[PDB]
């Protein structure tokens, strides 16, 4: 199909990969740091989602350098993915409006 849809699909799949890789890598980075809570995989996956969506409740977060770098990648991938879907939606509406005119 068209580019904007392919990119949206690709961005979504990629986002899911980053959430999975990020959850695993966050636990690896945080264990060994006294006080870290982002240390078991199930809640790390939850953490990765609320990070990618930019909600950031504060129930979980990284305290180490690498856990934070992993977090930054998760944030940017999430913002970029949703931004790209918005961009695809705009392309869709714009194309249609041209049609409604000619």
């Amino acid at each position, epitope marked *: 199909s068209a580019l904007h849809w392919r990119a949206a699909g690709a961005a979504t799949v990629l986002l899911v990969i980053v959430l999975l890789a990020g959850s695993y890598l966050a636990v690896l980075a945080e264990r*060994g740091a006294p*006080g870290a*809570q982002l*240390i078991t995989y*199930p809640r790390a996956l939850w953490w990765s989602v609320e990070t990618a969506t930019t909600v950031g409740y504060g129930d979980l977060y990284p305290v180490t350098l690498w856990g934070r770098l992993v977090a930054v990648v998760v944030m940017v991938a999430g913002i970029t993915s949703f931004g790209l879907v918005t961009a695809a939606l705009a392309t869709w509406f714009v194309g249609r409006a041209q049609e409604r005119r000619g």
Partner: antibody, heavy 118, light 108 residues
Framework: QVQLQQPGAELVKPGASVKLSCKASGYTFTSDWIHWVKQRPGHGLEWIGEIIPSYGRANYNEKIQKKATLTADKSSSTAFMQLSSLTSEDSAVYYC???????????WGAGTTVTVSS | DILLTQSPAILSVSPGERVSFSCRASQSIGTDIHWYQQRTNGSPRLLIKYASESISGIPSRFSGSGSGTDFTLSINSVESEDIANYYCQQSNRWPFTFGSGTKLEIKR
């Protein structure tokens, strides 16, 4: 079948070192962590450290004099704990346990009785 | 690091009576507490995970409760095989820590 295999015992002369093993069978995931716990006679369970075989990173109890060094051999599904320069304080049963990255020790090894004596 | 307190260290109960072991965390750990049983010369055995979740193979008699800083492991109608040491363990913060243990004694 026995998920975690540990030798029954190890005799070590004071000052020397010994390498304990923990052979795992059963389901194995890249996300499994192998933990080591020390228990002196008549006392409780003391957490020593952990290692993730798929990556090889290890963490240790910082609160106690560091006597251990953890390694893992992926091909033989065996985890190792190197204890060096031991004293009578190091004599105890050392258990290895498997954690699926979800916080609890689902299964434990039989433990290796380590004795420091001349 | 989280200090897990188990008091009393020894509990004497009569047969068939309900018993409760206490485990207190130095700070709130949600429900990230797990219980293990260790009989004489035996290895530890998982009884309850995340405060109250059942483990297959463990008798219905065992149950757990609590959240925050205070947790309880209970046994409905104690019998001889329950004589052992009981430990709590937390996985809320790194590093994982163990309670000091409680011994179960039966007065026959």
């Amino acid at each position: 079948q026995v998920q975690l295999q540990q030798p029954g015992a190890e005799l070590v002369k004071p000052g020397a070192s010994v390498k304990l093993s923990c052979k795992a069978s059963g389901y194995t995931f890249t996300s499994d962590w192998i933990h080591w716990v020390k228990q002196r006679p008549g006392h409780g369970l003391e957490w020593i450290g952990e290692i993730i075989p798929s990556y090889g990173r290890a963490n240790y109890n910082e609160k106690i004099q560091k006597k251990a060094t953890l390694t893992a051999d992926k091909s033989s599904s065996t985890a190792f704990m190197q204890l060096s320069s031991l004293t009578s304080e190091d004599s105890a049963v050392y258990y290895c346990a498997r954690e699926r990255g979800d916080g609890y020790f689902a299964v434990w090894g039989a433990g290796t009785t380590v004795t420091v004596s001349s | 690091d989280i200090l897990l307190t188990q008091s009393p260290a020894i509990l004497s109960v009569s047969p068939g009576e309900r018993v409760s072991f206490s485990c207190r965390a130095s700070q709130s750990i949600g429900t990230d507490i797990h219980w293990y049983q260790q009989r004489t010369n035996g290895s530890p055995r998982l009884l309850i995970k995340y405060a109250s979740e059942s483990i297959s193979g463990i008798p219905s008699r065992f149950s757990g409760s609590g959240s925050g800083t205070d947790f309880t492991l209970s046994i409905n109608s104690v019998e001889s095989e329950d004589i052992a040491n009981y430990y709590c363990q937390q996985s809320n913060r790194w590093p994982f820590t163990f309670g000091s243990g409680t011994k179960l004694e039966i007065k026959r």
